């Protein structure tokens, strides 16, 4: 188990959507077929809701020892 | 046929609380046959109405005399025999609240109907079986025709 919580921490989703808009901004393979708008800020919702995020989130526990979390393992919800 | 209620009506007193609008009157009217009671708003501009006037009332769940419940959206060009062609006054509607019965009631006599037609309020009361079919989220079409 983990002494963190499977649940969506707003800073995580926000910052890593910034990271993914960076990713597809620069040279990065297009996983989800870009249905029009080239901008990955508008396709970032598509990335996430299609779960094309192999990104490794290094949640850091009190000091040093961390966790790693792929964003699908959370409770991303409305 | 889907007459959810019907009655004949004449009015007793029009506005008992001053005239405080422009396009509406707040009617207070009573039935004779059954001891119902109608409080209703009626645009007097495009439908003048007086005190001593009499009119028959009905409240349908559809205006088709085939009684089928097919309604997507009023399409203005269409024409076929509907229940309106004998009346003089239409209003779409929605019933949103039925009050009078609190607990497991041993005699549910007085039950009220609360309807507002897109902004015009209507209050009718009566028994607790005649006034049935009236669920929540229950569209009805008020109809009316002044009778001599």
């Amino acid at each position: 188990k983990r002494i963190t919580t499977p649940y969506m921490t707003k800073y995580e989703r926000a910052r890593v959507l910034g990271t993914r808009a960076l990713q597809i901004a620069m040279c990065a393979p297009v996983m989800v077929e870009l249905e029009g708008e080239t901008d990955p800020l508008l396709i970032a919702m598509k990335e996430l809701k299609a779960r094309k995020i192999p990104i490794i989130i290094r949640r850091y526990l009190p000091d040093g020892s961390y966790e790693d979390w792929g964003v699908d393992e959370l409770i991303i919800t409305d | 046929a889907g007459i959810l209620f019907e009655d004949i009506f004449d009015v007793k007193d029009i506005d008992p609380e001053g005239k405080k609008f422009d396009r509406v009157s707040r009617l207070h009217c009573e039935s004779e046959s059954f001891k119902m009671d109608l409080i209703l708003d009626v645009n007097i501009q495009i439908y003048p109405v007086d005190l001593g006037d009499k009119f028959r009332l009905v409240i349908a769940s559809t205006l088709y005399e085939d009684g089928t419940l097919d309604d997507g959206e009023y399409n203005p060009t269409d024409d076929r025999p509907s229940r309106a062609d004998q009346f003089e006054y239409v209003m779409y509607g929605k019933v949103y609240r039925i009050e009078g019965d609190e607990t497991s009631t041993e005699a549910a006599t007085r039950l009220s109907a609360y309807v507002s037609y897109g902004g015009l309020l209507m209050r009718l009361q009566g028994d607790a079986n005649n006034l049935h079919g009236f669920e929540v989220d229950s569209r009805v079409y008020l109809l009316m025709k002044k009778l001599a």
Binding site: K1 | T103, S104
Partner: protein, 49 residues
Amino acid sequence: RRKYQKKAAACPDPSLSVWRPDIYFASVSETFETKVDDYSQEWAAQTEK
């Protein structure tokens, strides 16, 4: 002796204190469980009537 010394210790320490509310479900604090309980037995008896 045992019979008595059983009923001597505190109503155990708060839920929030032993169970971290992130992991474990339903980790409410005292003056909020009283609230949800308030409304539970205050609405049901209301709505049925």
